[PDB]
Design an enzyme around this catalytic site. Structure first.
Site, PDB file in Angstrom:
ATOM      1  N   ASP A 130       8.514 -24.673  -5.323  1.00 30.11           N
ATOM      2  CA  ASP A 130       7.651 -25.338  -4.357  1.00 30.11           C
ATOM      3  C   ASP A 130       8.474 -26.364  -3.599  1.00 30.11           C
ATOM      4  OD1 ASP A 130       5.689 -26.518  -2.841  1.00 30.11           O
ATOM      5  OD2 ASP A 130       4.396 -27.071  -4.527  1.00 30.11           O
ATOM      6  N   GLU A 181       4.345 -27.857 -11.506  1.00 30.16           N
ATOM      7  CA  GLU A 181       3.126 -28.572 -11.882  1.00 30.16           C
ATOM      8  C   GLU A 181       2.554 -28.101 -13.211  1.00 30.16           C
ATOM      9  OE1 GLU A 181      -0.017 -29.656  -9.310  1.00 30.16           O
ATOM     10  OE2 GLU A 181       1.243 -29.747  -7.511  1.00 30.16           O
TER      11      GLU A 181
END
Lengths: 328, 328
Positions: A237, A124
């Site tokens: 993730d 991200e």
């Protein structure tokens, strides 16, 4: 008719032989294989004393290559790798959260500098307020998976890390621009592969996520098969619930599990403890994970980024960072 | 207690589900995997409709990598390899037979020049009267396994063949100086591995020979695992009886067998037909063999060196040469 015809040995007994007891079988196997009865024991007590099988197993089975080598013959290398350590850190830094983005990114860079990992996976990452992360280029080589996108992943490696190639595979079943980022290189004479990803988010996207994961594990299998002796690190993730994790290939282990499955370091996304995001009910998951394969067998595992920033009273991310040190 | 806690979806049905029929299972699998019922059929009719298993198979089993790729994603290369051929010849030239050695070697060189193979394996090469074989260096790169020995093997490759490395592994269980000769290189952009050997002679040495063979097949397996898309050729004078041949790795085939198992080209050492050696009784064997792996799937197989030399009335060797052409 068209069968082979055997050479005559003139001073040979003029009749071959033809059921058996157990010790008879051990002796027979020993004589045929020119191995010992003690080794004959091993194989013969695994196929319920099926001799004719046991021969085929000794010569043709993949398990007994070692034995065969020993029968015929009588890269790193343990003593070089003792005294060697490598640390890998993975962090979803939640760049999509605009609140205090700059301050939080500065906190991220600060924490990275403090922890000082050799290898860092980021998820991200956004273009906006990226400056303090780009500043890390004084310590790291930085590779972005997909710059020019709303968000993307990054791999930062120590400058000792020689980079041979950088690949990005775009998941076609993804509605969230998710990718598998592969960095191939080396540390000294040790070949290293790094695989960083942010698997499809939310429980609903389980079918996409579970497909991506097994696909990633396929890529890992290939790398291991084609590069024996290499260090392979895969993770990031992964948004995994425990019952979603499928079979991992032999020689691949979860870092948190190999460190002893410590409850104190289990959850990497904890709404009870991290208030960057708030729900009516708390939630907690081991979303962020690291798997590895290679000639390092021991691992220490900690969480980082757990301190509240003081200027803005939030955490650097809604995720904790995972930090694993691998050694022998 | 230390279990993960799931995120609440407020507008979600507030109760998960929980036995099944068959079509129910197909639909269920389709929904969970986001695949179709037609594909669900496949897996579900292989594990006796064990759904919970079938999921684990779809995500974790190595067989379904392809499927997973197709689920996530939606070097040579068929059309380059069509129109490509490569010929490999193997010959035990019986250098240990001093009778008419020079004339016979000249015959050997002549025959090689006539057949013109891209790749040639030689066994029982001796230093004495080696000149006409060394003369082949105008057409070939020549590599000797163990020059300075009573006898040794050789690999000759076309000059288009780029050689990356030459290794010789000495079998320690051998009382006859036998080795595994490995030449690693390439033809254009196609990687090629060549493995030439003269396995332990005589029926009695079965334990040594069978150990060497399976060991050689282990080396072949490694090369295939580490070099996908590569051409691997292994063989020579293997001194094998049919019941000695152990399990060969997947993707590896016997050239004579893939050519159709022609009785006319079966035996490579025939005492009934080759009178260089005479016994009271005839003998015949498929001693000389060639196995391969790679992106060539078709093969033509012939015998050479079957004509009696006219000046000395013997054959170039007590062995026939084997010649295999591989193509797509």
């Amino acid at each position: 008719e068209d069968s082979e015809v055997e050479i005559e040995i003139l001073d040979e007994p003029e009749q071959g032989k033809l059921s058996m007891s157990d010790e008879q079988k051990l002796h027979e196997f020993a004589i045929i294989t020119a191995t010992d009865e003690a080794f004959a024991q091993s194989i013969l007590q695994d196929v319920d004393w099926d001799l004719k099988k046991a021969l085929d197993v000794f010569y043709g089975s993949e398990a007994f290559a070692e034995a065969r080598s020993a029968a015929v013959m009588g890269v790193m290398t343990a003593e070089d790798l003792k005294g060697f350590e490598v640390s890998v850190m993975s962090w979803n830094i939640d760049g999509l959260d605009g609140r205090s983005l700059l301050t939080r990114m500065k906190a991220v860079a600060h924490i990275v500098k403090n922890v000082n990992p050799d290898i860092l996976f980021l998820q991200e990452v956004v273009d906006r307020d990226l400056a303090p992360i780009d500043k890390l280029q004084s310590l790291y080589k930085i590779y972005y998976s997909n710059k020019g996108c709303q968000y993307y992943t990054a791999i930062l490696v120590s400058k000792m890390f020689d980079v041979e190639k950088h690949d990005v595979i775009h998941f076609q079943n993804s509605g969230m621009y998710r990718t598998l980022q592969i960095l191939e290189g080396s540390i000294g004479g040790l070949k290293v592969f790094l695989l960083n990803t942010h698997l499809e988010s939310t429980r609903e996207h389980r079918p996409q996520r579970c497909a991506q994961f097994g696909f990633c594990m396929d890529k890992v299998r290939e790398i291991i098969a084609q590069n024996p002796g290499a260090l392979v690190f895969f993770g990031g993730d992964l948004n995994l619930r425990d019952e979603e994790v499928s079979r991992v290939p032999d020689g691949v282990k979860d870092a948190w599990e190999a460190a002893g499955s410590d409850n104190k370091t289990k959850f990497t996304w904890d709404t009870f403890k991290n208030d960057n995001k708030q729900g009516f009910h708390g939630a907690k998951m081991r979303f962020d994970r690291l798997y590895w394969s290679g000639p390092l067998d021991k691992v220490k595992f900690t969480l980082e980024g757990r301190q509240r920033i003081r200027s803005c009273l939030c955490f650097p991310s809604d995720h904790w960072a995972i930090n694993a040190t691998f050694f022998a």
